[PDB]
Amino acid sequence: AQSIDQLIKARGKVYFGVATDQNRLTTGKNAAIIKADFGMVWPENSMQWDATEPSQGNFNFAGADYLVNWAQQNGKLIGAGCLVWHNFLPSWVSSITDKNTLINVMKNHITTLMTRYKGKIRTWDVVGEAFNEDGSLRQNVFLNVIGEDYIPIAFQTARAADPNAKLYIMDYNLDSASYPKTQAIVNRVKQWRAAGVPIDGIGSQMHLSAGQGAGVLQALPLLASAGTPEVSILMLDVAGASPTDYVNVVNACLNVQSCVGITVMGVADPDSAFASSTPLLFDGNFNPKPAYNAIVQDLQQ
Ligand SMILES: O=[N+]([O-])c1ccc2nn[nH]c2c1
Numbered sequence: 001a002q003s004i005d006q007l008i009k010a011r012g013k014v015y016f017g018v019a020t021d022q023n024r025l026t027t028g029k030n031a032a033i034i035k036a037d038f039g040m041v042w043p044e045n046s047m048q049w050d051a052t053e054p055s056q057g058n059f060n061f062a063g064a065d066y067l068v069n070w071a072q073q074n075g076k077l078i079g080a081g082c083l084v085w086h087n088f089l090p091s092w093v094s095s096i097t098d099k100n101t102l103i104n105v106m107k108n109h110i111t112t113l114m115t116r117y118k119g120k121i122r123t124w125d126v127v128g129e130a131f132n133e134d135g136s137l138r139q140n141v142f143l144n145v146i147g148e149d150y151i152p153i154a155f156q157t158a159r160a161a162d163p164n165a166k167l168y169i170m171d172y173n174l175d176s177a178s179y180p181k182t183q184a185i186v187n188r189v190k191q192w193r194a195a196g197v198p199i200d201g202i203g204s205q206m207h208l209s210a211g212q213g214a215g216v217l218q219a220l221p222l223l224a225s226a227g228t229p230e231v232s233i234l235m236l237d238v239a240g241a242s243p244t245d246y247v248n249v250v251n252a253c254l255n256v257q258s259c260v261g262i263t264v265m266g267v268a269d270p271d272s273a274f275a276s277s278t279p280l281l282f283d284g285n286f287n288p289k290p291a292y293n294a295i296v297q298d299l300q301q
Helices: 004-009 030-037 062-073 099-116 141-146 150-161 180-194 213-224 243-255 290-299
Strands: 015-020 040-043 077-084 123-128 166-172 201-208 230-238 259-264
Touching (some): 004 015, 015 077, 040 062, 040 259, 062 077, 077 150, 077 166, 099 141, 099 150, 123 150, 141 150, 150 166, 150 180, 166 230, 180 201, 180 213, 201 243, 213 243, 230 243, 243 259
Parallel strands (some): 015 040, 015 259, 040 077, 123 166, 166 201, 201 230
16 A cells, blocks of 8 residues: 555554645646545645735635535535634734724634635645744734634634534744744743633644654643643645655654644645645655655555
């Protein structure tokens, strides 16, 4: 067996996933590789705020429907996001200056997207990139205008929109247990859960430099100590694609009982935003790279 999704499921995890979108599925060998080797897809761009709600209350789902329908057509799980973050955020939103207006805009955005696909989506990334590197909360428009309540409200709204989905907060630079940001998200998530915020998961966005895989072995169990039902690895790529870095990340998930799976940022190196760092698991000829084969070896029993 050569599918890393099949192999990780045979170790008891839920999926090995990949980010994609209509533009990828219509070209190259992406669809064929995803069908063969991955068990879950995420929309890279098509579910982000600027794509789905380019003006207030005016929604569009052309790309998102394409991806969701492709996943259902091909028997793949779906993760989607990000509902509330500063990236891909239209200026019409970040121009809002008052709490109630932004709350209602945010709630309508969450509810409309999640209701459209109710029951079909495994995981929603509800809040993203909410932390500064020092562990304080990032002064995005949601924090600046709503205040700290925005995170409780976002999660409570998402739970109502689709109670079947696993609701995640996600961030990057959570890759060392000694880094302030990693410690802060754990402390805040534990506080938020004790306050009744339904945070089901922490997702670690792992855009890694060479050699950073080893730190994840202790960072991931730190993240899991916040008490969420789940943790996951998102947006994974590694500059140089060292088998060692990738195997370390996989082993971290294997060693964390609440880690449900791993999502890689793309399929083939030339299509990565970081293509020249050759950071993915397939080369430009769509052949599996040494890191892919090292994952296969690590997961086979
Ligand atoms: O894991 N992912 O590659 C991924 C990509 C885009 C997203 N938007 N929200 N969550 C996401 C996860």
